[PDB]
Design a protein around this ligand. Structure first.
Ligand SMILES: O=C(/C=C/c1cccnc1)NCCc1ccc(-c2cc3c(N4CCC[C@H](C(=O)NCc5ccc6sccc6c5)C4)ncnc3s2)cc1
Ligand SMILES: O=C(/C=C/c1cccnc1)NCCc1ccc(-c2cc3c(N4CCC[C@H](C(=O)NCc5ccc6sccc6c5)C4)ncnc3s2)cc1
Ligand SMILES: [Cl-]
Ligand SMILES: [Cl-]
Lengths: 468, 469
């Protein structure tokens, strides 16, 4: 079973002896710091998952306290574990956490440098607990960063899909998650795939569906979708001389639905020009608009291969010109680039496609490691800092202001998030939120004393993160 | 509960209708493709994946029904192989009819070598080999953490030896500060365990639990830590009392090494004045066993380390060691934990060497740089089919993309061998059959739902030791 006591940074365990004596309240906040792709606005998503799966309900037990005491005794070569303080949470509160967490609604799109959630203890005996859970709470940068980075790529696709097409049809299916293999672990797969689906509807990371359903929920039958697709083993199993028989068997097996067939096993160009183009050309034309053939290259320079694949297919299938003057394949043929795609190369591909007058209706993208694994806590400066302590009945605003780095500066005091008269967001410090000059605090209590007090559906989160 | 039927790539759900008819065997392998050049990799983590996700009765009639419900909605068509899964439940009691053979964990293998192979033991489950590709390819992460960690250990031993003449304390020099940095809790444990294959110091506690549960060690725990401060336990005394926080913390942990972050307001001022004059008496008094460690969390990593060392040198008696390098008094040490990755770490030690400072003075903490800034792309960890049997005929299969020379894969049934000189070679096309029995490194670790050979963490550490060690 998961044990919360063994779920914190090792140095934190000794923290209780280090705060000022008679400290009754430790108050901390989480933000995505401004740094002086831009990544100016970040999507808040994923806190609920950590609340339900790791903090809600009874999370302290006699067993868990004894397991922890014995680990830290060897780990530290000394008895420094705060047994008495953990036991207190067990006896007085039936092992529920005396903590309050207020957060922006999940799905809200917030400019950098703003407070998105705050943590404090509700019992003065548990001043040490606020930051005890900072490590677990700080892990939300991953869901935040995936969904923010996912959504920035959605912006890019929209811009060019509108520039070359005149509409946004299918936008939500244009970036497909191919990252299940790439992620550090099964749990990360689920979280990461969940954050992508805040913005899109296509994934092959089946773990993401289970996570949404268990912790968020949706009125829809499933949060995400996919189609049959081939992989190198299925294609290469027939042997190199029978690449055409595999293609034929696979399009025949899935004729009523879209099918993605990777065509780079031996020679991408040969498959496109001769096998798809001439030998199996009759099969492609027959397919309905609803179930088209998606030719997938998986090798070479990502932009250059996309372009040359499109030129060959244009020289082999009836290509038309849409309203904006960009060339468009027939509806039974599409292309998916799923190799070497991240936010940067995605920009180069679409910009390349536009200047050679190919419309974005033709293409879709797959991203794996570039979508769910090549991201760091550093990207958005997600950080968790103490802004307010109460010691001996006196509240004082606490912050860090390193001389070397201006940016690592932390907000001071009790904080709140407000909507401005112009319609933007401002974070107020030093309890200024109490005055309510700009209206009510947008932070809502989502956790208190071991109970999840406000929850959002994945369907709300999707609507809050919609592009303007 | 975790469900294997829901733990694969969506499109693999439809692969059982794509293989050639009458396919009775699908045989695949894993390797880190040939491209700090990352020439050799440490194999670690498969045992975790075998025990947690692949052993025992991993199929139930309830799990089949769950998977069938999701997939029908997910693809919006009926494509789930209910019958194939049902066959595994009835005839094997939901145990996987799969054999996996693997190089021993801890082994250091040059790139381009097969590390393990997967094959189905029952002709009806030809579709099962690559169904579990996604779950097994995720051993790219422990392999990559263990490998990158090791490479940093190489750097640190070379410069510790040059500036010191000994490797004392080497395995405590790179300290895991990555628990907050990782994507998920499961990752934090896997990664931190992988780093402990080379070092003994970690603060990602999840790492300790994973090793004990899956690998085990004779010692009570594999990783150690000390008490240390954070920005909240300094700044909560108020800016005007940073000296009082320092004094309180050092006093509390007098008998053990204690590390305090001193850059909350002004790092230079803190070292020169608060540590240097106001609290100097409390530092000199401290024992060699439990020295004061000063940590700077801001600014340029190389510059700040030097400026801290320069200042402390002027307030504390500095000696010169056997090799002619500057060495702080035994009760005072520094630890750099901000912005450290394999690249910067090399720069810092090299920078220290230029200014004639012994590596004995320093320790490093790494967070995201150690456990998060890593991709499957770094070592080209990849899982490919190399051999199938269709219509009772064995065929060697491979992918040879024209555009990329490197992506090409091995053909046939594989084996790993050591020549009498000691270099490694993987024999393709089943030519390992020609070689004498017992030569092959790959030992069966998983067959039909049971783990058949296991290694303990102590042995894994022994296997992964550096040549210099
Ligand atoms: O390849 C793989 C393998 C991945 C993998 C996994 C693991 C490891 N390694 C790799 N998985 C492909 C899955 C996939 C990806 C994208 C799409 C798209 C749908 C769509 C779209 N909707 C949605 C479907 C229904 C309609 C509709 O059917 N429209 C027709 C249409 C139009 C354009 C395009 S472009 C590609 C398909 C397509 C279909 C309207 N509206 C505009 N754009 C697009 S894109 C469909 C399926
Ligand atoms: O501050 C932090 C920040 C944490 C954090 C967490 C999460 C997020 N954010 C931050 N974590 C400090 C933990 C830490 C790190 C490194 C070390 C070292 C020990 C050691 C060593 N030993 C080991 C102990 C016994 C002997 C011995 O003499 N021990 C005393 C000694 C000697 C040299 C040095 S050098 C630096 C320390 C030190 C201590 C020999 N032999 C040579 N090198 C080193 S390094 C000790 C403790
Ligand atoms: Cl593939
Ligand atoms: Cl810290």
């Amino acid at each position: 079973e998961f044990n919360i006591l063994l779920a914190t940074d090792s140095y934190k365990v000794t923290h209780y002896k280090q705060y000022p004596p008679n400290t009754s309240k430790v108050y901390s906040y989480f933000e995505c710091r401004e740094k002086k792709v831009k990544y100016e606005e970040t999507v808040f998503y994923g806190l609920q998952y950590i609340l339900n799966k790791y903090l809600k309900g009874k999370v302290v037990t006699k067993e868990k306290i004894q397991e922890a005491k014995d680990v830290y005794k060897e780990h530290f070569q000394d008895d420094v574990f705060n047994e008495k303080g953990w036991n207190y949470i067990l006896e007085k509160y039936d092992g529920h956490l005396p903590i309050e967490i207020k957060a922006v609604p999940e799905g809200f799109v917030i400019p950098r440098g703003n407070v998105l959630f705050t943590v404090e203890n509700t019992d003065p005996e548990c001043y040490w607990l606020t930051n005890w859970i900072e490590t677990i709470l700080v892990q939300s940068w991953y869901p935040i960063t995936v969904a923010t980075n996912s959504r920035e790529q959605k912006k890019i696709l929209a811009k060019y899909l509108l520039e070359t097409s005149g509409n946004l049809d299918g936008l939500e299916y244009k970036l497909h998650d191919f990252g299940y293999r790439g992620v550090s672990s099964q749990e990360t797969a689920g979280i990461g795939a969940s954050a992508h689906l805040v913005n899109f509807k296509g994934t092959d990371t089946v773990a993401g569906l289970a996570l949404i359903k268990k912790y968020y929920g949706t009125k829809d039958p499933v949060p995400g979708y996919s189609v049959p697709a081939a992989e190198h083993s299925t294609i290469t199993a027939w042997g190199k001389d029978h690449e055409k028989d595999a293609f034929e068997h696979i399009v025949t097996q899935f004729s009523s639905v879209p099918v993605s067939v990777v065509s780079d096993s031996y020679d991408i160009y040969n498959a496109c020009e001769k096998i798809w183009g001439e030998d199996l050309r009759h099969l492609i034309v027959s397919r309905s608009t609803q179930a088209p053939l998606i030719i997938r290259p998986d090798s070479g320079n990502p932009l250059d291969t996309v372009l040359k694949v499109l030129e060959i297919l244009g020289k082999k299938f009836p290509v038309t010109e849409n309203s904006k003057g960009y060339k468009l394949l027939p509806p039974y043929l599409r292309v998916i680039q799923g190799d070497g795609v991240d936010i940067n190369t995605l920009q180069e591909i679409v910009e390349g496609m536009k200047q050679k007058m190919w419309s974005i209706e033709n293409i879709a993208f797959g991203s794996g490691g570039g979508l769910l694994q090549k991201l760091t806590r550093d990207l958005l400066n997600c950080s968790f800092k103490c802004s307010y302590v109460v010691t001996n009945g006196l509240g004082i605003n606490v912050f860090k202001d390193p001389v070397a780095d201006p940016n690592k500066r932390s907000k001071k005091g009790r904080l709140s998030l407000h909507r401005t008269p112009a319609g933007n967001f401002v974070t107020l410090e030093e309890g200024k939120g109490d005055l309510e000059e700009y209206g009510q605090d947008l932070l809502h209590t989502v956790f208190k004393n071991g109970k999840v007090t406000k929850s959002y559906s994945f369907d709300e989160i999707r609507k809050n993160a919609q592009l303007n």
